[PDB]
Amino acid sequence: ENYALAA
Amino acid sequence: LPTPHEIRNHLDDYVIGQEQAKKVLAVAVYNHYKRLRNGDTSNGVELGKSNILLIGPTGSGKTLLAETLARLLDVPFTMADATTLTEAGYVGEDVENIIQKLLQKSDYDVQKAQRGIVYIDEIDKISRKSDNPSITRDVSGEGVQQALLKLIEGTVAAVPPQGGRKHPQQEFLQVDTSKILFICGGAFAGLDKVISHRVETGSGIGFGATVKAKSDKASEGELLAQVEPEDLIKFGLIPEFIGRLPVVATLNELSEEALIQILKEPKNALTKQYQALFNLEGVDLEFRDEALDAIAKKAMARKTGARGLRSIVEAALLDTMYDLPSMEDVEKVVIDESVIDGQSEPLLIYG
Amino acid sequence: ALPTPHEIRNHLDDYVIGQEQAKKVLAVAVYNHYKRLRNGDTSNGVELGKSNILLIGPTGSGKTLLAETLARLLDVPFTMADATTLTEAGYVGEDVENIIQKLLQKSDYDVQKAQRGIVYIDEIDKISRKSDNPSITRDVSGEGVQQALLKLIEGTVAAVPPQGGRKHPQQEFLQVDTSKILFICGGAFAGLDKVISHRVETGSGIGFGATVKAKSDKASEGELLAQVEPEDLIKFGLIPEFIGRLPVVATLNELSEEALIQILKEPKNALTKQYQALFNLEGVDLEFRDEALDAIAKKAMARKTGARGLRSIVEAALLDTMYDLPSMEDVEKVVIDESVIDGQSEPLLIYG
Amino acid sequence: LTEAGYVGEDVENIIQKLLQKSDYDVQKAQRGIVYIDEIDKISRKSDNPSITRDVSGEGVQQALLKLIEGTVAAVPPQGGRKHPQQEFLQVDTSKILFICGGAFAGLDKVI
Amino acid sequence: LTEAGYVGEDVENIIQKLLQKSDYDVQKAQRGIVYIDEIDKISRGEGVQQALLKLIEGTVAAVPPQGGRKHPQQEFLQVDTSKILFICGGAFAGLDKVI
Amino acid sequence: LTEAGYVGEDVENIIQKLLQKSDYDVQKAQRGIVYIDEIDKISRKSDNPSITRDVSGEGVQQALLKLIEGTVAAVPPQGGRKHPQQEFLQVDTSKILFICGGAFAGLDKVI
Amino acid sequence: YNHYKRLRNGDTSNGVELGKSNILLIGPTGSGKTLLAETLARLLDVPFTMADATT
Ligand SMILES: Nc1ncnc2c1ncn2[C@@H]1O[C@H](COP(=O)(O)OP(=O)(O)OP(O)(O)=S)[C@@H](O)[C@H]1O
Ligand SMILES: Nc1ncnc2c1ncn2[C@@H]1O[C@H](COP(=O)(O)OP(=O)(O)OP(O)(O)=S)[C@@H](O)[C@H]1O
Ligand SMILES: Nc1ncnc2c1ncn2[C@@H]1O[C@H](COP(=O)(O)OP(=O)(O)OP(O)(O)=S)[C@@H](O)[C@H]1O
Ligand SMILES: [Mg+2]
Ligand SMILES: [Mg+2]
Ligand SMILES: [Mg+2]
Ligand SMILES: [Mg+2]
């Protein structure tokens, strides 16, 4: 349950 | 079903000083609904989709017109924000969520959702920008515009079936966006500069030449009507995006007459708020007619819209509010025109 | 009963010195905020809208200190946030909504209690653009934060994880409104005085008619900032949309020499008291003469770092004494004269 | 170090390093000493384009302000990168001492 | 596209826009029509023209398939621009005097 | 192509295109050939010394030197730019052949 | 050679910490700078890496 990508 | 006169009448009850914009919104909304009823329209010609684009300065009724419209109409209405939106697969948000929220408002009635409205505020914030070396990637921008564009052009959208549990049975009901109405708004700050260059050729130098002063600068008020798609593209929008929004409702800056009405005519007007504030404090507040005119002149100068009014009133009553609780036996407070300018301080009845 | 603004200002006066206008604004807002909190039902057809505050002042004026003092006296939840850490949605830095989460913690996750809360966003001038122009690149740590804060200030529903995002996939995120939350955005706008001068100090040419002040008659930042208007802020880098949400603009004056002398001794946690306590636990008594305090104020004013300058002047004067004082024995009192600040003399010592 | 939201290391990472020394004992780290070397490498370029952002030099100074003065800073346990939807260890830098250093080049000319 | 920064991504985006309309069909997309506007403005942006002509001459472009959070390099669809017809438009006001 | 640190473009993109032609088979790319066009544009023609910076010209030649000579090159997976991300595969250009072609204008006058 | 000597006395039982002295090679083109490094890597047991400062 990893988090979404962040720029 | 609703008539434009009815729409404008309901809007006028809550909005002040946007006669032309209200007309455009009413006409566009009515025509859009008439288009949905007569899908075939007994003709080979297909009517262009009328999606409104609201352009106006701060504190002019953009975010208010949308809310008032929702109150009147019965169809679903969702108020999104472009700032939250981001490119797909990022932490911020997704564009598909808009339809999801729309269905929740419509009780998951796909038939009703396809007939709903959608208001996107702060659309100017997703304007295209030049690449930054330090930033990893520019997600809140062009990418979001393309997602909204594919949503506006008309495409099926998959919505989970109420999110019953981890596994929702993968129903992924399809929602069509071809019949949905979009109202994209935002104060395109800096657009007046782009428009000015395009339509202003400067001034001459001779005797016969017409010299133009700063008062003739032709600022955003009366300068946003001349806007063309080329100016928006320079601001950062996509050309195809503009073509999807033919209707361009422009909101002019609020005049002193409109501001004075806002001070007293609304049910939750600024003057009524302070009166209630004083009333629960055992005091009665009275605003003179001259004072309201002075407040509007100061607020207009600030170029902050109707929100400026609170700044002027707060400053005038700052000292009074600070020492009114300590003062005893005071039943009424009167604000004269001088109080707004600061030369005098507000008469207090000690009866 | 309800605390009146006079009572609130007195508690602020104990720790703050000289900021009368700013103290009034905060006192009035807190009183109005409590009035709204009590009259939550509002049995009338009127919605009492909030007025956000914007604190502007030089360094060492008392902005952050005012917020800290306020927290001590605030029954409702109060949190202090830094705008530097915030970033626009979708970026590595942070999410603006985190402030509300920080606020809920203060209220033990009582949404109804948090909604009626106060927030102080410090360093608000550091999320500003460089010019009036919209932008040239994505200003994540800048206008992007301002664009994100608009909805937070005006009023909206923000999502918040109650305990942990990883405990459950959705975790039934809490929805908390902000239409009633009060915001106090405080920043030390640097270069704003220059902007106002260009708009106010006209006729700055070269001829006879032109006025040249030679940095003597020139109005200081404290006097100039008093004439601040939103248009000046737009040029500094703020968004028009962001100022309208902050109608109340309270300004803090530059600290004069007399105010600095008061700061040294009168406040509860005054600088002199701190050094006296440091020596007191060491077995020594520290005495400051009145002449010394006047000298320290003049030196600190030159630094143009606010009241923080005082610490530099005092620490430098007591550096030699603090270094060799523990080695010394039988020393019970230390006296600082006016000459000690200049450096010509050595602080007098008492043995016994 | 760099300003928040950019690819470079954040300013809160300093506290993370401090936690390593204290076996992740926040109470023990809040009373620590910190030495920030090469503090002269973060300086405003006076003669530079107005419309730009000095994330490396000015942003770092802006970010360190609340840290030096004292604030409840968010500290990722590992500290590699900051993620908004991530658990953070709140640390207070009001008692931490900072000793900045750096060979200022060209200061003698300014003086 | 006159910015002249990461032109490869910007020109590639054009192809990506076509695929969305093409329903992510490489065969149908390769038959598409591309219209470029205001081609006169870039003239004086030599780098912009150089990037464009490579796209006009024909090249293979990598477009992410059906969006997605993260996808491997190989998964990217390979479309050829040699088979795509490109139309360049624009008004050349000064050109009349030149003739 | 631009000097590293500038937003225009980087010199590693070349190898990226080469990988695409080899189906991302590194061992098959190292044995490849690369044609670099418009090399004369990089030449300092109207140099006007670059005390501020030289990005489109001398800054590109300096970068290519090791690429041509042969060194491991960090290549992003696909259509990405360099960043702290560690999702980079190393490619060796020691055996790659380079054919730099340019329509040098005014060289005849120099000769 | 000195690098190897410092590695042998990992413990360094003395009140002395040996500090490294870095090298700066200056020379014209086609002189042997890069070549010297490559040759060194052939006979270097300790990890040797080559970096390009332009990137
Ligand atoms: N025409 C109007 N009639 C009545 N109240 C108005 C009008 N225009 C502005 N107001 C007042 O201003 C408030 C905000 O108006 P908005 O329509 O939100 O302005 P805005 O265009 O949304 O500003 P932003 O920040 O650019 S979204 C309303 O709640 C009213 O109190
Ligand atoms: N009016 C004041 N009364 C008492 N102490 C003060 C006053 N102004 C400054 N100080 C002292 O200066 C310290 C810092 O004051 P702050 O208000 O935090 O400065 P500032 O306004 O935050 O400037 P910043 O944070 O760089 S924007 C306080 O902790 C006090 O010790
Ligand atoms: N002293 C030398 N002995 C043997 N071969 C040499 C010598 N100097 C140069 N060479 C040859 O020249 C080639 C390049 O030498 P390098 O040392 O790489 O040049 P350089 O010192 O790197 O100059 P740069 O890197 O272009 S500034 C080598 O591969 C050898 O073939
Ligand atoms: Mg709005
Ligand atoms: Mg502060
Ligand atoms: Mg060629
Ligand atoms: Mg070499």
Please give a structural write-up.
The structure is cut from a larger assembly and holds one copy of chain A (7 residues) and six copies of chain B. With 7 residues, chain A is mostly loops. Chain A is rod-shaped and about 20 Å long. Chain B has 351 residues and is of the alpha/beta class. Chain B has helices at residues 4-14, 19-37, 62-72, 97-105, 110-113, 142-153, 191-199, 229-235, 239-244, 256-264, 270-279, 289-302, 308-316, 318-323, 337-341, and strands at 52-55, 77-81, 117-121, 156-159, 173-176, 181-186, 249-250, 284-287, 332-335, 348-349. In chain B, helix 1 crosses helix 3 and helix 7 crosses helix 8 (229-235). Chain B has 15 helices and ten strands. The chains are: A little secondary structure (7), B alpha/beta (351). Chains in contact: A-B, A-C, A-D, B-C, B-D, B-E, B-F, C-D, E-F, F-G. Chain G: It comes from Escherichia coli (strain K12).
- How large a portion of the residues of chain A is in β-strands, by DSSP E? under 5%
Query: Based on helices, strands and strand pairing, what is the structural class of chain A?
Result: little secondary structure
Largest sheet of chain A: none
**Cα distance spanning the termini of chain A:** 19 Å
Estimate the helix proportion of chain B, in percent.
40-55%
Reported for the largest beta sheet of chain B, the result is:
5 strands, parallel
Principal-axes geometry of chain B comes out as globular
Q: Which pair has the most extensive contact?
A: B-C, 59 and 55 residues
Going by helix content, strand content and strand pairing, the class of chain B is alpha/beta
Helix content of chain A: under 10%
Number of separate structural domains of chain B: 2
Bound molecules: phosphothiophosphoric acid-adenylate ester, magnesium ion
Spatially, the strands of the biggest sheet of chain B line up as: 2-3-6-1-7
Distance between the termini of chain B: 57 Å
Number of helices of chain B: 15
**Rg of chain A:** 6 Å
Order of helices and strands of chain B: HHEHEHHEHEEEHHHEHHEHHHEHE
The tally of beta strands of chain A, per DSSP, is: 0
Shape assignment of chain A: rod-shaped
PDB class: chaperone
Keywords: Protein degradation, AAA+ protease complex, chaperone
Entry title: ClpX-ClpP complex bound to GFP-ssrA, recognition complex
Chain A: Green fluorescent protein
